[PDB]
Amino acid sequence: QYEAFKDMLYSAQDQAPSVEVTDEDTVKRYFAKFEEKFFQTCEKELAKINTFYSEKLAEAQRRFATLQNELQSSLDAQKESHEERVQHRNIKDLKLAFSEFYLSLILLQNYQNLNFTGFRKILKKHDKILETSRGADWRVAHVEVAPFYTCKKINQLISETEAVVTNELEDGDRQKAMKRLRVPPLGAAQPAPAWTTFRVGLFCGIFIVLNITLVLAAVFKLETDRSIWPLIRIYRGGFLLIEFLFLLGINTYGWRQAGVNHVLIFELNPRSNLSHQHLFEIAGFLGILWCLSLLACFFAPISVIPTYVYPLALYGFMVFFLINPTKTFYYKSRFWLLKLLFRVFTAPFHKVGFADFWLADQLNSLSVILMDLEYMICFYSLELKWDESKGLLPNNSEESGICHKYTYGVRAIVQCIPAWLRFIQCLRRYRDTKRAFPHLVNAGKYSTTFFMVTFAALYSTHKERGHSDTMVFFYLWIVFYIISSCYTLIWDLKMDWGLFDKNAGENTFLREEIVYPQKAYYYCAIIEDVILRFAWTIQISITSTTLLPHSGDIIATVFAPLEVFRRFVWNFFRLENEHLNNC
Amino acid sequence: KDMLYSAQDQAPSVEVTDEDTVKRYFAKFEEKFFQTCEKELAKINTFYSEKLAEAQRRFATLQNELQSSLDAQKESHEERVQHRNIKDLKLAFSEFYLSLILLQNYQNLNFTGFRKILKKHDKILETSRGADWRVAHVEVAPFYTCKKINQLISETEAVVTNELEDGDRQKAMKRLRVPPLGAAQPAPAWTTFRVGLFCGIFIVLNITLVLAAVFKLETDRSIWPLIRIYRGGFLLIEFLFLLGINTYGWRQAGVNHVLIFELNPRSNLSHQHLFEIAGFLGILWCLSLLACFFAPISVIPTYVYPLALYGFMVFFLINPTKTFYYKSRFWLLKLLFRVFTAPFHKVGFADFWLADQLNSLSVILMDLEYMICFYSLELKWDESKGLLPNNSEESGICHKYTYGVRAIVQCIPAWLRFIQCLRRYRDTKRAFPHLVNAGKYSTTFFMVTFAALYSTHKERGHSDTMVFFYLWIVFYIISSCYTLIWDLKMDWGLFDKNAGENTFLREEIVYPQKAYYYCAIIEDVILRFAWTIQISITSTTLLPHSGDIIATVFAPLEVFRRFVWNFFRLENEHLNNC
């Protein structure tokens, strides 16, 4: 109430005239009016302070009752592998609750002290201006006799509860309890040693310069005599992967800006995790490797092996890095990732957790890399002859198009593997939980993909023979597209993010409680998602406006670094909503 | 991790004797560990008891002082005296409380470390007696559990604020706000990110530079003048990088260079910052060089690209604004101003150091002389036709010696050292060091004037030129070996006659390895007589266009000598004077 006191003092000073400016009676009347206004303001401030103190006392009592109930529940659970993990989670939750209670008590004490200091300052200012001694008396009767400052049993109770929790759970491990209940938590990273950040900067700088020299060489040195397009087909997918990692770096920083606890939801080791700088430096390493490989393929200084070793060497280096058995180069993280890939493929043996379907969904937007893997095998096995030079093969030959066409239609299965595995995983989820409300609908949502791809493949295979009745099949493909798109939209908005809920309140189109700073970010994310998820519609416009061959493959390449973005933005609010419920 | 590694490396024999001997050995090791842990616990308990006694004594003294102040108050100048006494008592109480809190925190940290070590030993040795003993005895210390000291201190502060400060609780709390102690000086992560960026771009640009030079470059064009220009900038960025390495070395060695330089207690700079500016300089130099040779854009001539860079140089220093390390540039500008006068200003250590550095940066003095030279009487500003893009004798009267414009620019830094040392002798009235420095720097003038007169006489054909040149060579050594005996005797303070247990070195040293010292000595001997190789190579038939190549390759080694000489010069004066 410092602002109100300052405004009242300014108004009183303005209402106070000079000695000779106004008459004695008028000056006395103005002084009486100012004193009455000051008394009314002081009474209002005292009432507000009393109400705030009562509310704070009620909140403290409620917090103490909740802490006691949680402690009793934890003691009952302790009295009466997976069990060890559950006990550790309960201990961590109790420690977090105790730390929150201590922080709330400290904040309440600091706020009470600040309010008392402000009241004393306002009383001093009123005494200086209006020459009245009532402010000091009010401050003495209120600030000095404040029950909140006098009540110090809260600190003793908090200390006793913390000691009891440490004795019962930590079994005398005071260091772990102090670390878990430490006042500082988020905020200061904590910064890594300077070598890691220096490596990140060096790697990103080399990546940038290599990109500039690559584009300059492509626009200047390259001769438009040979179709470089297949090269993109063997490189594009790799780019997506590295791009993905870059985003993931920033992604984790997001979870460090909102303060949402995300290490626990992944069941990761709290004393060993992967910071954003590590992901950034891995991204830099893979990026510089990719740039050097592509530049070497572009120039080929040595005219003995034109193309057959550069992409294969790059991908072999990548996989060897992935499954390196030595205890170096983030061995623990690589082993954990390989174990989770095993688990997501060996689903039926063990329970399904968060990270399982999280990684499954991430791969769902990464099917392009599977397409390019099938394409490299596709080019290398049937129609490319190893015994040649350079590889200047004109497209006029009839050998081309052999595995551009669907042939047996294997492309549908390789396209739909993520959908199939998500369908199976959701089915097992329903079998284990016996509850079908959020699962069979999810199964149908992933099942729409089967129909989408099979219709697209059948139309593409059958358009050449004729049978003008394919217009009906084209219409069915389109309507399946629309229904899949709206199903994905509604599932993402209502269920995945919890937005558009019937219980909105003052935060229109939002949930009751949010953690991200601004709402314009929410709205911009929504509009970006709703433009991106009908990307293919824009594609169809080209096929409705141009008859130029092979025009759809370039726009698809531009379309490729967009499904990684819509997952990047979706990965933000997914953990926010999932912070509420449990899997 | 010492227990985990040392114990595992023992590798006891599985089948060498009966299990009784192994059990006895394990029991003996456990008993020794228990005795060590008991001794450590007793020492920690004694330290904690001493800290608690000191804290109790400090609290009693503070309480007595507060009671005396309250009694005096209860009973103008008297009010001011009472306020000053209250402030002094509050400051003393705050200092005592901070010391007690630090002691308690140290004791708690020591106890936690001992408990962690015991737990690690128990886990490694697969035993439960040590952890149980630590939990029963070390973890049951009542001193750590007792936290009434903080509550009593807070209550005393509140009472003092209420009774003495008259409701100024916030001021008392701020004056007695001591709890989470601890501070350091960590470098910002963005600084390391920036230096990493600049280093990466700089190396990659050097690689593209060398590839372009070896591949696309053709012989017909004139390469020499361009490298004459670019040597100065290369030397500048090199010196900046070695200066950063030098200041990191001083900081790590613990030599208090900030006090001997009388800098502000912030140092006005950090080695990371030197690294960033050096990287930015290298980026500009590489971009400019690639622009000159590649020349991709329009019809802009190649003779303008360096100027902007060089302009940027002065633009970096004479920028009116308040950005780009505004404290360092102003300090360096004023120091470089006060160095270049000499008689007008007083002599300080920084001026002596800067003049010494400028002595070795000889090349960056006459490169600009050739610069203004071509841009005065060799340029083709207006048009671009057959206006002598080729080379002949007339264009290039300037890269030789000829007039004294080159000898004098070579001799400026020695002039500055001579005059500054004479000023020191004048205002100090000291004989030996300044007088011998006068000679050691007049040898420089003698060598340069002899070489200049030889060069200007050879072009005319006077017979005595074949004699005087013969003298030039000796006039070099009589200088050079003098300078050497100066760097080791007094400049570094080595080869002391009253040497002790340490061979060929002074008795007290700070750097770890003596091999560093020996390497420094031998490197100084090699690079101080570097000019012998120059005359050795040009002591025979003169290969066409092979004159100045030796200078370029020998240029960065001279600064590399300045790299090592700076380590001991600062240390020797720091150790002996301070």
mmCIF file of C-alpha atoms in Angstrom, chain A residues 121-277:
data_model
loop_
_atom_site.group_PDB
_atom_site.id
_atom_site.type_symbol
_atom_site.label_atom_id
_atom_site.label_comp_id
_atom_site.label_asym_id
_atom_site.label_seq_id
_atom_site.Cartn_x
_atom_site.Cartn_y
_atom_site.Cartn_z
ATOM 1 C CA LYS A 121 8.003 4.271 5.917
ATOM 2 C CA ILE A 122 4.466 5.485 5.172
ATOM 3 C CA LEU A 123 4.008 6.453 8.825
ATOM 4 C CA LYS A 124 7.302 8.366 8.775
ATOM 5 C CA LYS A 125 6.310 10.174 5.570
ATOM 6 C CA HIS A 126 2.905 11.071 7.026
ATOM 7 C CA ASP A 127 4.560 12.390 10.191
ATOM 8 C CA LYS A 128 7.003 14.450 8.116
ATOM 9 C CA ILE A 129 4.314 15.920 5.852
ATOM 10 C CA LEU A 130 1.148 16.309 7.942
ATOM 11 C CA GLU A 131 3.007 16.749 11.275
ATOM 12 C CA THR A 132 0.936 14.030 12.937
ATOM 13 C CA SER A 133 2.084 11.339 15.363
ATOM 14 C CA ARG A 134 -0.763 8.885 14.674
ATOM 15 C CA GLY A 135 1.183 7.017 11.987
ATOM 16 C CA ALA A 136 3.940 5.988 14.392
ATOM 17 C CA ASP A 137 1.365 4.774 16.923
ATOM 18 C CA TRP A 138 -0.448 2.789 14.225
ATOM 19 C CA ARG A 139 2.820 1.227 13.044
ATOM 20 C CA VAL A 140 3.778 0.310 16.616
ATOM 21 C CA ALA A 141 0.353 -1.220 17.268
ATOM 22 C CA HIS A 142 0.354 -3.119 13.953
ATOM 23 C CA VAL A 143 3.847 -3.699 12.531
ATOM 24 C CA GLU A 144 5.505 -4.435 15.877
ATOM 25 C CA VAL A 145 2.566 -6.544 17.100
ATOM 26 C CA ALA A 146 2.112 -8.470 13.836
ATOM 27 C CA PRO A 147 1.173 -12.095 14.649
ATOM 28 C CA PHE A 148 2.893 -13.392 11.499
ATOM 29 C CA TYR A 149 6.300 -12.068 12.569
ATOM 30 C CA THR A 150 5.796 -13.254 16.155
ATOM 31 C CA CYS A 151 4.752 -16.769 15.072
ATOM 32 C CA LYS A 152 8.086 -18.541 14.556
ATOM 33 C CA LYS A 153 6.859 -22.100 15.199
ATOM 34 C CA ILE A 154 6.492 -22.633 11.435
ATOM 35 C CA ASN A 155 10.269 -22.773 10.963
ATOM 36 C CA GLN A 156 10.692 -25.268 13.812
ATOM 37 C CA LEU A 157 7.875 -27.447 12.460
ATOM 38 C CA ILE A 158 9.386 -27.359 8.960
ATOM 39 C CA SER A 159 12.809 -28.316 10.327
ATOM 40 C CA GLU A 160 11.305 -31.187 12.329
ATOM 41 C CA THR A 161 9.400 -32.451 9.281
ATOM 42 C CA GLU A 162 12.533 -32.254 7.119
ATOM 43 C CA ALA A 163 14.558 -34.152 9.728
ATOM 44 C CA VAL A 164 11.846 -36.820 9.997
ATOM 45 C CA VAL A 165 11.722 -37.195 6.206
ATOM 46 C CA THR A 166 15.516 -37.464 6.007
ATOM 47 C CA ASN A 167 15.640 -40.072 8.786
ATOM 48 C CA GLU A 168 12.767 -42.202 7.477
ATOM 49 C CA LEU A 169 13.538 -42.052 3.743
ATOM 50 C CA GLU A 170 17.176 -41.035 3.234
ATOM 51 C CA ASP A 171 18.272 -43.169 6.233
ATOM 52 C CA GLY A 172 20.614 -40.436 7.437
ATOM 53 C CA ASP A 173 21.675 -39.211 3.986
ATOM 54 C CA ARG A 174 21.776 -35.517 4.898
ATOM 55 C CA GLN A 175 23.572 -34.451 1.706
ATOM 56 C CA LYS A 176 20.866 -35.869 -0.572
ATOM 57 C CA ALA A 177 18.107 -34.246 1.492
ATOM 58 C CA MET A 178 19.926 -30.899 1.443
ATOM 59 C CA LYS A 179 20.406 -31.114 -2.332
ATOM 60 C CA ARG A 180 16.741 -32.008 -2.870
ATOM 61 C CA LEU A 181 15.512 -29.344 -0.418
ATOM 62 C CA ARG A 182 18.045 -26.682 -1.444
ATOM 63 C CA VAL A 183 16.669 -23.174 -1.914
ATOM 64 C CA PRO A 184 18.187 -22.743 -5.412
ATOM 65 C CA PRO A 185 16.885 -24.943 -8.240
ATOM 66 C CA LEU A 186 16.139 -23.564 -11.702
ATOM 67 C CA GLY A 187 17.654 -20.387 -13.129
ATOM 68 C CA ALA A 188 21.429 -20.740 -13.348
ATOM 69 C CA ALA A 189 21.762 -23.639 -15.854
ATOM 70 C CA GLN A 190 24.360 -24.550 -14.008
ATOM 71 C CA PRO A 191 26.931 -23.554 -16.651
ATOM 72 C CA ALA A 192 29.080 -26.302 -18.129
ATOM 73 C CA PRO A 193 32.886 -26.036 -18.228
ATOM 74 C CA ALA A 194 33.988 -23.612 -20.916
ATOM 75 C CA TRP A 195 35.399 -26.351 -23.159
ATOM 76 C CA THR A 196 31.933 -27.711 -23.980
ATOM 77 C CA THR A 197 30.526 -24.314 -24.971
ATOM 78 C CA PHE A 198 33.709 -23.494 -26.891
ATOM 79 C CA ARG A 199 33.320 -26.734 -28.843
ATOM 80 C CA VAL A 200 29.668 -25.887 -29.522
ATOM 81 C CA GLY A 201 30.634 -22.485 -30.908
ATOM 82 C CA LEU A 202 33.514 -23.836 -32.990
ATOM 83 C CA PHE A 203 31.316 -26.556 -34.478
ATOM 84 C CA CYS A 204 28.478 -24.166 -35.329
ATOM 85 C CA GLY A 205 30.901 -21.703 -36.925
ATOM 86 C CA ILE A 206 32.481 -24.359 -39.127
ATOM 87 C CA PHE A 207 28.979 -25.552 -40.031
ATOM 88 C CA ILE A 208 27.942 -22.037 -41.065
ATOM 89 C CA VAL A 209 31.017 -21.435 -43.218
ATOM 90 C CA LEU A 210 30.677 -24.850 -44.850
ATOM 91 C CA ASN A 211 27.047 -24.059 -45.674
ATOM 92 C CA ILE A 212 28.010 -20.752 -47.305
ATOM 93 C CA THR A 213 30.822 -22.294 -49.343
ATOM 94 C CA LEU A 214 28.490 -25.146 -50.320
ATOM 95 C CA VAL A 215 25.788 -22.841 -51.668
ATOM 96 C CA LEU A 216 28.384 -20.701 -53.462
ATOM 97 C CA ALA A 217 29.953 -23.769 -55.087
ATOM 98 C CA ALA A 218 26.525 -25.096 -56.076
ATOM 99 C CA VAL A 219 25.427 -21.834 -57.690
ATOM 100 C CA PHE A 220 28.799 -21.130 -59.345
ATOM 101 C CA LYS A 221 30.892 -24.263 -59.897
ATOM 102 C CA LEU A 222 28.144 -26.815 -60.572
ATOM 103 C CA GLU A 223 27.276 -27.426 -64.226
ATOM 104 C CA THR A 224 23.634 -28.120 -65.124
ATOM 105 C CA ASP A 225 24.475 -31.087 -67.340
ATOM 106 C CA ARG A 226 23.728 -34.002 -64.997
ATOM 107 C CA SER A 227 20.567 -34.495 -62.934
ATOM 108 C CA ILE A 228 21.813 -33.936 -59.388
ATOM 109 C CA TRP A 229 18.288 -34.676 -58.120
ATOM 110 C CA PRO A 230 19.002 -38.297 -57.027
ATOM 111 C CA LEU A 231 21.773 -36.928 -54.802
ATOM 112 C CA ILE A 232 19.144 -34.947 -52.905
ATOM 113 C CA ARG A 233 17.127 -38.154 -52.548
ATOM 114 C CA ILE A 234 20.093 -39.811 -50.822
ATOM 115 C CA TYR A 235 21.019 -36.743 -48.749
ATOM 116 C CA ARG A 236 17.733 -35.016 -47.851
ATOM 117 C CA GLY A 237 16.730 -37.573 -45.240
ATOM 118 C CA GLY A 238 20.049 -37.298 -43.446
ATOM 119 C CA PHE A 239 19.607 -33.539 -43.218
ATOM 120 C CA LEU A 240 16.250 -34.005 -41.511
ATOM 121 C CA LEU A 241 17.846 -36.203 -38.865
ATOM 122 C CA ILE A 242 20.577 -33.717 -38.016
ATOM 123 C CA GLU A 243 18.084 -30.861 -38.158
ATOM 124 C CA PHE A 244 15.928 -32.822 -35.720
ATOM 125 C CA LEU A 245 18.735 -33.044 -33.177
ATOM 126 C CA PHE A 246 19.336 -29.299 -33.362
ATOM 127 C CA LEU A 247 15.698 -28.623 -32.512
ATOM 128 C CA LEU A 248 15.805 -31.141 -29.671
ATOM 129 C CA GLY A 249 18.587 -29.096 -28.108
ATOM 130 C CA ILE A 250 16.462 -25.965 -28.034
ATOM 131 C CA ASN A 251 13.546 -28.180 -27.038
ATOM 132 C CA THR A 252 15.134 -29.208 -23.751
ATOM 133 C CA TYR A 253 16.049 -25.588 -23.020
ATOM 134 C CA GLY A 254 12.337 -24.856 -23.191
ATOM 135 C CA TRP A 255 11.703 -27.334 -20.397
ATOM 136 C CA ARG A 256 14.346 -25.437 -18.415
ATOM 137 C CA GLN A 257 12.637 -22.068 -18.989
ATOM 138 C CA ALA A 258 9.160 -22.978 -17.713
ATOM 139 C CA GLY A 259 10.553 -24.912 -14.749
ATOM 140 C CA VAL A 260 8.490 -28.004 -15.553
ATOM 141 C CA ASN A 261 10.178 -31.127 -14.211
ATOM 142 C CA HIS A 262 10.841 -33.388 -17.199
ATOM 143 C CA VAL A 263 13.686 -35.652 -16.052
ATOM 144 C CA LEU A 264 11.325 -37.532 -13.730
ATOM 145 C CA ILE A 265 8.670 -38.165 -16.394
ATOM 146 C CA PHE A 266 11.326 -39.869 -18.547
ATOM 147 C CA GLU A 267 12.538 -42.010 -15.599
ATOM 148 C CA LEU A 268 16.045 -40.728 -16.344
ATOM 149 C CA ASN A 269 18.849 -40.586 -13.809
ATOM 150 C CA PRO A 270 18.480 -37.363 -11.764
ATOM 151 C CA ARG A 271 22.248 -37.269 -11.142
ATOM 152 C CA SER A 272 23.133 -37.883 -14.815
ATOM 153 C CA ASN A 273 21.332 -36.164 -17.698
ATOM 154 C CA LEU A 274 22.118 -34.611 -21.087
ATOM 155 C CA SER A 275 22.245 -30.813 -21.180
ATOM 156 C CA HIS A 276 21.384 -28.754 -24.245
ATOM 157 C CA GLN A 277 25.030 -27.966 -25.032
#
